[PDB]
Design a protein around this ligand. Structure first.
Ligand SMILES: Nc1ncnc2c1ncn2[C@@H]1O[C@H](CSCC[C@H](N)C(=O)O)[C@@H](O)[C@H]1O
Ligand SMILES: Nc1ncnc2c1ncn2[C@@H]1O[C@H](CSCC[C@H](N)C(=O)O)[C@@H](O)[C@H]1O
Lengths: 154, 159
């Protein structure tokens, strides 16, 4: 199933929100940059106890390359969630069963050294003038789309 | 070539928290909703709203419909050919995975605490729910709205 990697995300509100969404959709694991975030009050406000029920794993940003390489060997497709020239449109993207979603930092997105390690980048198409979506919302949309496709395939 | 007029209406009048309203404002702008309806335009004056909306309020039409005026507003939109879709977990809700959105869709989101009140459930044409797998009872209301806005958008793009 689905691994969501939030190690690049800085804000406890985004992490806490994502924790709730991952739990609701039955993600296999949510990966965070520091287990300390789980006990942050802003995180807890948004996660509404989801952390009790969702597997959580710490992978610090410096360890991401090695972690993602290991997941490839286990049969995961490493999917960057990002707006890039080479990104595939989410409306056109059929998820592999073993999908891993890498979310970007709120300010910096996914850095070039990590883009290089990805199997694919997937982009949510936009119609308005605002540059991008919130990172938690972005992750929610891909988590949902993966889930929708899997429910329909099964 | 050519950008179609947006039919999608998102109604957030029942939502209380400025963080949810601001987040939803950004999402609605990004996906080109025709309008975001709010319970009070006071919300856009709030720093918490502004932090999350990232100026989207400058580009997305906002209209105020106070909750006591909601029934009249929804009735007028039916007259204009809108399907009034409650976004809510109920025994008669249609599963989002099986729901085909009409072009003129209006999404009514519930209050964070109270959901959609009974007097408004009466006014709905249909209720739509996002299926869940885990233990937690519900999604955040802005995230719920984002998922329906996305599914509406995906469906319209495929046709
Ligand atoms: N339309 C979209 N498609 C895919 N990811 C998106 C997205 N909008 C926001 N994101 C996600 O949210 C993160 C923070 S947004 C910051 C970078 C953004 N691409 C920019 O140039 O402004 C991104 O790194 C990505 O993971
Ligand atoms: N799975 C889901 N499907 C559809 N709407 C949902 C949803 N999860 C949350 N929502 C939306 O988010 C709002 C706040 S959740 C409101 C309280 C919730 N009914 C409870 O019992 O705890 C709802 O009114 C609805 O509009």
């Amino acid at each position: 199933r689905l691994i969501v990697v939030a190690s690049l995300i800085d804000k406890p509100t985004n992490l806490g929100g994502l924790c709730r969404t991952c739990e609701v959709f039955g993600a296999s694991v949510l990966v965070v940059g520091s287990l300390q975030c789980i006990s942050d009050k802003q995180f807890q406000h948004l996660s509404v106890s989801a952390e009790q029920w969702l597997p959580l794993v710490e992978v610090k940003p410096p360890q991401l390359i090695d972690y993602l390489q290991q997941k490839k060997t286990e049969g995961y497709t490493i999917i960057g969630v990002e707006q890039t020239a080479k990104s595939l449109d989410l409306t056109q993207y059929c998820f592999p069963e073993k999908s891993l979603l890498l979310l970007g930092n709120e300010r910096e997105g996914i850095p070039a050294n990590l883009i290089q390690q990805l199997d694919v980048c997937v982009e949510i198409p936009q119609q308005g003038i605002i540059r991008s979506l919130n990172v938690h919302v972005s992750g929610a949309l891909l988590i949902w789309e993966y889930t929708r496709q899997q429910l329909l395939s099964h």
